[PDB]
């Protein structure tokens with residue numbers, strides 16, 4: 001499955017399996033920004049993503065977009 | 075988990091009840107108390123979120139530059155068999171070099187105090203790192219709840235911080251709110 | 256889990272604060288109006304369905320008056336107010352008992368969490384956590400002093416039958432037992 005992460009100032013596409021936890025992507029994308037995973041808030045279907053969740057768990061479809069917002073707390 | 079329940083309890087048992095009625099209470103106050111809360115910035119509920127769960131009961135004790143002015147008119151409602159259960163909120167002035175630099179409705183998120191007390195009382199025990207994580211989870215769950223409560227959520231602002239002047243911390247948030255207008 | 260936090264918050268944020276002063280507030284009320292009913296009775300429906308108006312839930316439960324209120328500062332809020340309501344419990348129009356009566360409000364949070372999909376909380380979760388809320392609260396009060404043991408928890412399931420259910424009888428039964436065990 002292919003996916004994309006966008007914060008508005010940058011976009012990075014990712015390719016991973018459906019049972020791979022999204023922990024890797026969120027850390028990968030945040031590393032590019034010079035920020036650790038916690039300081040960013042990731043959204044799919046309007047819902048905050050958690051590190052142990054897989055695309056199969058969230059019923060993702062190929063070529064979906066993931067929104068990356070600056071986490072304001074912490 | 076614990077923080078998830080406490081955040082929903084904070085929303086279900088407090089914010090969803092008082093936020094829709096807050097402007098009416100502030101109007102009533104301003105009209106019979108000299109328009110003390112002028113402008114949108116001074117008409118939101120500011121919720122303090124110390125991520126170390128240190129929640130003194132007296133805000134002046136936390137910062138001398140935070141000083142109590144008055145109370146809004148009380149909200150009452152029938153609640154779980156209690157007639158006229160009372161919800162009340164306090165107005166504070168923020169001082170900068172002795173002068174009134176700001177005026178807002180200000181308070182702590184009480185469940186953070188609950189988390190701390192649970193570390194003392196709880197029999198199974200509750201460690202510092204667990205408490206700091208649950209404090210963060212409470213704040214982020216509350217953020218998420220409010221984002222999905224578009225009907226009422228722009229009546230409040232969350233002020234989270236780690237430890238310093240609390241008054242300045244608040245004033246910085248207020249000045250940023252005024253600039254973003 | 257959820258129930259554990261809500262039960263500790265119920266003790267820390269309410270019962271520990273009002274139970275010690277409850278006796279005085281009841282006395283103050285008695286003298287006005289020219290003078291078992293000295294405990295706080297707390298309804299705990301295990302399905303967490305908690306109406307806000309007791310009188311509309313059972314005709315034979317009728318509001319009488321409020322106790323004098325109690326106040327205290329907390330978390331930067333000056334003069335948080337604690338109020339409690341006195342009810343008469345009727346049988347066929349006749350006053351059969353009188354007590355301070357309310358629901359355990361946190362059960363509404365459990366119920367709401369099972370209704371909001373964002374809470375990730377099923378009906379089965381709600382029913383389990385409701386029972387865990389009751390047992391934790393019972394454990395807490397069992398370790399509390401005498402000044403915090405003057406309340407009665409009343410936990411109950413409403414029949415899944417169409418058969419009627421009397422909330423007033425559920426309370427009166429405990430009032431009667433207490434009179435017997437005197």
Ligand SMILES: Nc1ncnc2c1ncn2[C@@H]1C[C@@H]2COP(=O)(O)O[C@@H]3[C@@H](COP(=O)(O)O[C@H]2[C@H]1F)C[C@@H](n1cnc2c(N)ncnc21)[C@@H]3F
Pocket residue numbers: 083084085086087088156159160161162183184185188264265266267268269270332335336337338359360361364
């Ligand atoms: N007035 C308020 N001012 C500020 N914040 C408030 C207020 N009300 C609610 N909140 C928010 C929402 C949280 C959950 O509210 P809830 O009513 O669902 O659960 C309550 C329990 C936990 O209380 P707390 O630790 O203060 O957490 C509160 C606080 F974070 C104890 C008990 N209780 C407490 N006070 C009373 C009372 N006056 N009358 C009857 N029962 C009372 C209730 F079961």
